[PDB]
Amino acid sequence: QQRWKDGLQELRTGLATVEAQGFQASDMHAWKQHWNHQLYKALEHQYQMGLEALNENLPEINIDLTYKQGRLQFRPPFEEIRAKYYREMKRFIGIPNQFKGVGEAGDESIFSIMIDRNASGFLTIFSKAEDLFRRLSAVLHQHKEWIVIGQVDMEALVEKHLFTVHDWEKNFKALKIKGKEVERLPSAVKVDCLNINCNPVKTVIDDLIQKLFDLLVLSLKKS
Amino acid sequence: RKAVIKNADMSEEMQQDSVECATQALEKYNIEKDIAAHIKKEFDKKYNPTWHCIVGRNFGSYVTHETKHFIYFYLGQVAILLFKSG
Amino acid sequence: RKAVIKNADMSEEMQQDSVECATQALEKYNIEKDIAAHIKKEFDKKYNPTWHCIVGRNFGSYVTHETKHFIYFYLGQVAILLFKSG
Amino acid sequence: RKAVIKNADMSEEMQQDSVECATQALEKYNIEKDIAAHIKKEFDKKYNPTWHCIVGRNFGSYVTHETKHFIYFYLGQVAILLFKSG
Amino acid sequence: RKAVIKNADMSEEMQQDSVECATQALEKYNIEKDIAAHIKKEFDKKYNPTWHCIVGRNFGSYVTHETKHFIYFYLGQVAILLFKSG
Amino acid sequence: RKAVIKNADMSEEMQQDSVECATQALEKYNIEKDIAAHIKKEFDKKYNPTWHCIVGRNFGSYVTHETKHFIYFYLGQVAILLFKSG
Amino acid sequence: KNTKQAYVQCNEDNVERDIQTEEIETREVWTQHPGESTVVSGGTSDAVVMPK
Amino acid sequence: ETLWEIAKAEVEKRGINAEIAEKFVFFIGSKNGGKTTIILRCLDRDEPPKPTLALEYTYGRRAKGHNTPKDIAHFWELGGGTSLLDLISIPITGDTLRTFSLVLVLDLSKPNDLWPTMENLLQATKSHVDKVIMKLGKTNAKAVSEMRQKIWNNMPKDHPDHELIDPFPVPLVIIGSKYDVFQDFESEKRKVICKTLRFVAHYYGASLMFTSKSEALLLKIRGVINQLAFGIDKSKSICVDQNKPLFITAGLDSFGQIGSPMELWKKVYEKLFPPKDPARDPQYAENEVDEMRIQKDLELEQYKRSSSKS
């Protein structure tokens, strides 16, 4: 975007050079108004491109996930990062209607019309936005559903109905398998816009299995 | 300007009148003593004497008030203390 | 903290006590809330309740006081309003 | 150039506006005193007085500010301190 | 630490006190933030709050001060800005 | 002519730009003073002030630079010294 | 009578902050146009000869 | 084995109703109707209002007092007859209809231009929420039955439930905006306008409130429909007699009282007001328009080929 602004400044200088030659309204009008129309087409191109791949080309956003007392915590809050996401979408569409290039003293309407004219693209950028957040919502639940994070106490259950030869091997092999599984929980998930760090999750779910590991092995020995 | 209530031991109706009365006083008067006077007089009329009002940008107070007749709030940067005593 | 009395409806002995009391409060306490609190309490003890004290650099007020129990004075740049009501 | 916020006790809107205002000031002016003056004046207009601004490459400060009205950030190698007090 | 006063709106006695205070601050403290903090606190104690101090070799400022409470001076190569506001 | 870097305390990208900028300056100007002026001004704009540039066929120097902003190199028989300080 | 004591302070809070900028790292360097292969230096394996 | 079954059973059993699953609300209104100002103040923000809206998102946070559970409320808004279904259909899904409610804000500036505006917007949203209840192929429709049976038996608290004059299976509260201009209408017009507002309240079973400073009901009732965010119903008395303030408790607004169906609509409708170049062709350029043409086509065609399922 800085290069867009820089080029417009050069055009305004060129126009200033034209008018500085002592011309009348008719002559300077021809210059600025004609080029202003060509700038419309150039700017409308920029706007249309965004409407197709706006979400794909927004600034990076990161968020840290962690577990506390059996609840998924966010740092910063989830509602916050998505609000920033939405504001970036808004900021884009708010550019092709505040235009100070050739003919900066003229009527800005020459450009702002493109916002409503190509407004059919709003469905595209917002549908993609919603699908991304839908997909983010799904994986957030998967991190809570795959490995239970409540993990209520288990001592009573194992001491009352466990640690016979056959039943225990079934329970403990399944535990070791869950260990192998959590070792594969990705440290982050990348989508079109957002990056979520899930490394803190991997740590906690690994410890949770290890806690169960010790419970079963330690009380088996005394059976 | 924007009303922000910091403290109140006061019914909801009197609280709203405190803000409304101070709002009108601040719009109508420039001098603090006259702003305060407007607010006080309005309360004496509707909710009986004896009310007291201090309006300003820089003060502290330590006062005794009647139960259910105390509010402290700002309109923008201007603090208003409004209470009954006597 | 030079004292200048601007207005009073108060005996000379209470006027002097007000200045000396406020002067001590101003020497000891930095925050107006505490200065006002000091002053008020000393009067309730010596001259019976109910006293009120407002201390500050920028305010106006409109208050009702008991006859012979009102003073308004400065210590340096800080105004102190001291009166009985209730 | 690149804005990096190190400290802030300030709403998100004022944070971004402070950067934007400083960015324009740095583009328009070379001398720190004039950069600061631009930033200060704009804040007094948009967010009410009284703001103060310090701009520089080498300093230490100790200041007192109003809650929710303090930011310290860099534009490149130039530090900008902006806060409300008074 | 030779002192050169560039601008002041301050009594002569406070001007001298400021220079002597800042001079001691630079003898005692190595870091600008701590130099500024020392100086600020000494004025809050003697001259009432709210004081602000900037100490450094490279900065500009634009500030608002209370009349008769501003000084800007150098001690050698180090500039000290000392004023009351709020 | 052929660029030969002898010493550098500078990033690889800035090193190449320094040579390229001096090369263009040497192509455009015959006078060393004017070559230096071109090189200095371009660096202040792209990499922030304050740079200094010396261009010549016969000199010795002893200077102080900011880290990552010093290069000394030849273009043929002409030496160019470029750094930031201040 | 049922009365209460209370107080208000306009200056409800006064937040103090300390600010310190970083330092600038500088070095002293030599240069000289006429001279030896090593122009300037900051103020025995010899594996350098072996390739030739 | 049984260890995981128990762990699963408890995390599944609990977690619906720290704070319970939050609701969210959509704001039906017009463009630059003053709605943004009300919303931003309700959320306790100091932000300047934006006139335009393109499916805007905002949120707020409340506490309870024993702790800060971080009670988050999500908000969506859109104003004017712009991309109505293209945007309204996106944040509203049947799976979350239980937690979704509507609020309608009326700009009193131009009641004439407002009635066709709000009607079209209400039709678009009503149609959508009505469909999503089973559009998703929700075989387990028990929730669908509960939603319609609860909503359509909450307004007719005492009045016989003769008919559903307009099946509206989602909560609604109606509020005005910028009533400061309302006093400046002809007395006859103010009365007909008031009847119109009350009429709509009946069809939708939506309470009505005025807009002021002392009128704290505005914030509260929004909180009520917004998952009790700012208190509970706090039912007050109707103001059909005074006609100076506007207020309706949904359920007491019988036509026989507020109007005193089609016939009542016809009366107020007809009485108040019945009359309800990007081409750049004449221009020439060679290099500018050719290159823009080429680039325009190449980028758009690539984005179409991506064959996104969105």
From Swiss-Prot, chains B, C, D, E, F:
There is a cross-link at residue 40 (Glycyl lysine isopeptide (Lys-Gly) (interchain with G-Cter in SUMO2)). One of its GO terms (molecular function) is enzyme inhibitor activity. It comes from the Eukaryota. Keywords: Acetylation, Activator, Apoptosis, Chromosome, Cytoplasm, Cytoskeleton, DNA damage, Dynein, Host-virus interaction, Isopeptide bond, Microtubule, Mitochondrion, Motor protein, Nucleus, Phosphoprotein, Transcription, Transcription regulation, Transport, Ubl conjugation. It is found in: Cytoplasm, Cytoskeleton, Microtubule organizing center, Centrosome; Chromosome; Cytoplasm, Cytoskeleton; Nucleus. The keyword DNA damage applies. The modification N6-acetyllysine is found at residue 33. Induction: Up-regulated by ATMIN, PAK1 and estrogen. One of its GO terms (cellular component) is plasma membrane. Phosphorylation at Ser-85 promotes recruitment to DNA double-strand breaks (DSBs) by TP53BP1 and ability to inhibit MRE11. Phosphorylation at Ser-85 appears to control the dimer-monomer transition. According to PubMed:15193260, it is phosphorylated at Ser-85 by PAK1, however, according to PubMed:18650427, the DYNLL1 dimer is not accessible for PAK1 and the phosphorylation could not be demonstrated in vitro. Residues 64-86 are annotated as: Interaction with ESR1. GO terms for biological process: apoptotic process; DNA damage response; intraciliary retrograde transport; motile cilium assembly; negative regulation of DNA strand resection involved in replication fork processing; negative regulation of nitric oxide biosynthetic process; negative regulation of phosphorylation; positive regulation of insulin secretion involved in cellular response to glucose stimulus. The modification Phosphoserine is found at residue 85. InterPro entries: DLC_sf (IPR037177), Dynein_light_1/2_CS (IPR019763), Dynein_light_chain_typ-1/2 (IPR001372). Changing residue 85 to E: Abolishes homodimerization. Abolishes interaction with BCL2L11 isoform 1 and isoform 2. The keyword Acyltransferase does not apply. PANTHER family: DYNEIN LIGHT CHAIN, DYNEIN LIGHT CHAIN 1, CYTOPLASMIC. Belongs to the dynein light chain family. This is Dynein light chain 1, cytoplasmic. It comes from Homo sapiens (Human).
UniProtKB/Swiss-Prot annotation, chain G:
Expressed in chondrocytes (at protein level). It is found in: Cell projection, Cilium; Cytoplasm, Cytoskeleton, Microtubule organizing center, Centrosome. Acts as one of several non-catalytic accessory components of the cytoplasmic dynein 2 complex (dynein-2 complex), a motor protein complex that drives the movement of cargos along microtubules within cilia and flagella in concert with the intraflagellar transport (IFT) system. DYNC2I1 plays a major role in retrograde ciliary protein trafficking in cilia and flagella. Also requires to maintain a functional transition zone. Intermediate chain of the cytoplasmic dynein complex 2, a multisubunit complex, composed at least of eleven different proteins. The cytoplasmic dynein 2 complex consists of two catalytic heavy chains (HCs) and a number of non-catalytic subunits presented by intermediate chains (ICs), light intermediate chains (LICs) and light chains (LCs). It is linked to Short-rib thoracic dysplasia 8 with or without polydactyly: A form of short-rib thoracic dysplasia, a group of autosomal recessive ciliopathies that are characterized by a constricted thoracic cage, short ribs, shortened tubular bones, and a 'trident' appearance of the acetabular roof. Polydactyly is variably present. Non-skeletal involvement can include cleft lip/palate as well as anomalies of major organs such as the brain, eye, heart, kidneys, liver, pancreas, intestines, and genitalia. Belongs to the dynein light intermediate chain family. This is Cytoplasmic dynein 2 intermediate chain 1. The lineage of its organism: Eukaryota, Metazoa, Chordata, Craniata, Vertebrata. The gene is DYNC2I1.
UniProtKB/Swiss-Prot annotation, chain H:
It comes from the Eukaryota. GO terms for biological process: determination of left/right symmetry; intraciliary retrograde transport; intraciliary transport involved in cilium assembly; regulation of cilium assembly. Disulfide bonds: none annotated. Keywords: Cell projection, Ciliopathy, Cilium, Cilium biogenesis/degradation, Cytoplasm, Cytoskeleton, Developmental protein, Disease variant, Dynein, Golgi apparatus, Microtubule, Motor protein. Acts as one of several non-catalytic accessory components of the cytoplasmic dynein 2 complex (dynein-2 complex), a motor protein complex that drives the movement of cargos along microtubules within cilia and flagella in concert with the intraflagellar transport (IFT) system, facilitating the assembly of these organelles. Involved in the regulation of ciliary length. Light intermediate chain of the cytoplasmic dynein complex 2, a multisubunit complex composed at least of eleven different proteins. The cytoplasmic dynein 2 complex consists of two catalytic heavy chains (HCs) and a number of non-catalytic subunits presented by intermediate chains (ICs), light intermediate chains (LICs) and light chains (LCs). This is Cytoplasmic dynein 2 light intermediate chain 1. It comes from Homo sapiens.
